[PDB]
């Protein structure tokens, strides 16, 4: 990858941990954010609104970091 390429390859792992872990709370908010937030990376293009997409996977991602 390089960018977007990339992108798409960060959240598909994302899933694989959550999908394996358990439990609600911190687990319930990050799932629904999850998948919606994929959708968004296809509904996006190569360049500009990339920026606010790529926010949104920042933040739940550090957000499994800790749990
Ligand atoms: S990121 C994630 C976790 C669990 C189910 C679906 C997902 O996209």
Redesign the pocket.
């Known amino acids: 990858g390089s960018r977007v390429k990339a992108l798409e390859e960060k959240?598909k792992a994302?899933?694989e941990?959550?999908?394996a872990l358990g439990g609600g709370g911190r687990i319930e908010e990050?799932?629904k954010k999850?998948?919606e937030?994929?959708k968004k990376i296809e509904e996006l293009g190569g360049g500009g609104e990339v920026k606010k997409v790529e926010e949104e996977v920042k933040k739940?991602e550090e957000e499994i970091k800790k749990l």
């Open positions: 959240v994302l899933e941990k959550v999908k990050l799932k999850c998948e937030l994929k739940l």
